[PDB]
Design a protein around this ligand. Structure first.
Ligand SMILES: NS(=O)(=O)c1ccc(CCNC(=S)N2CC(=O)N3CCc4ccccc4[C@@H]3C2)cc1
Ligand SMILES: [Zn+2]
Length: 258
């Protein structure tokens, strides 16, 4: 009886196995754009993905992850609210059953069709597993998806999903350039938070870009053909793999822009 996103094992149940689910810095949150304050102390954000080395794509039963080689400083996130160097390890998405829901963060209570999470770890902790035990261990770059024009840089991901339909399937996924998933502007909001899935560790600096990317209805329809289940088990479509907004508590969301 493992965690997931069903009626019986979904987000409102997670606190029984992961009591930090009711903690002081949980994610995601609603970004109230009128209360977020411009912070002129935020240094410029530096996304350096030219040397990124993707390896594999995996269906892990709750999303699909594109994994990178993080054994040197090839693809790094720096600047903005961050002290030091954060190495890209994986990206994944959260999405809905319908275009009106799917994002984890909300903007003035608006839900987007999906949300991309580019996950990075603080290299001063030596490995990812050590970094997730630290309050500044991870930086997650969050990017909203809206349905409109296709995102050409997404299509190589969309086209491999048929090969990883079910939990535990992986496929080789080399030479994928995550720069193709970025919007034009790097204007962002930032706050301290958590992983949005169990174990819900409070180790994340969140950086959520204001500008959504556009993907086509056919692109997001292909995400919704994935399965939560393993091969040879009852088919359960991988949809609505998002945690709703959590209480902000004693936190301020800062804006990089006026
Ligand atoms: N939705 S979210 O953005 O808040 C979020 C971000 C990150 C996580 C943790 C997911 N775990 C992840 S992504 N892990 C587990 C692990 O120990 N290793 C470390 C070793 C390794 C090496 C190469 C490539 C991958 C890995 C995995 C990655 C969970 C949730
Ligand atoms: Zn995520």
């Amino acid at each position: 009886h493992h965690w997931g996103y069903g009626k019986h094992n979904g987000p409102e149940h997670w606190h029984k196995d992961f009591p930090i689910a009711k903690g002081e810095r949980q994610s995601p949150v609603d970004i109230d754009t009128h209360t977020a304050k411009y912070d002129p102390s935020l240094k410029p954000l530096s996304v350096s993905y030219d040397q990124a080395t993707s390896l594999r794509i995996l269906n892990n039963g709750h999303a699909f992850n594109v994994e990178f080689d993080d054994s040197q400083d090839k693809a790094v996130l720096k600047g903005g609210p961050l002290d030091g160097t954060y190495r890209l390890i994986q990206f994944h998405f959260h999405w809905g059953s319908l275009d009106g829901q799917g994002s984890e963060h909300t903007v003035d209570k608006k839900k987007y069709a999906a949300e991309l999470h580019l996950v990075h770890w603080n290299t001063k902790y030596g490995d990812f597993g050590k970094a997730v035990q630290q309050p500044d261990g991870l930086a997650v770059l969050g990017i909203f998806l809206k349905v409109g024009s296709a995102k050409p840089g997404l299509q190589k991901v969309v086209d491999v999903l048929d090969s990883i339909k079910t939990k535990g399937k992986s496929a080789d996924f080399t030479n994928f350039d995550p720069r193709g998933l970025l919007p034009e502007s790097l204007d962002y909001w930032t706050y301290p938070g958590s992983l949005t899935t169990p174990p819900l560790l409070e180790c994340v600096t969140w950086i959520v870009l204001k500008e959504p990317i556009s993907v086509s209805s056919e692109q997001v329809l292909k995400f919704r053909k994935l399965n939560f289940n393993g091969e040879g088990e009852p088919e359960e479509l991988m949809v609505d793999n998002w945690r709703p907004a959590q209480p902000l508590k004693n936190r301020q969301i800062k804006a990089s822009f006026k």
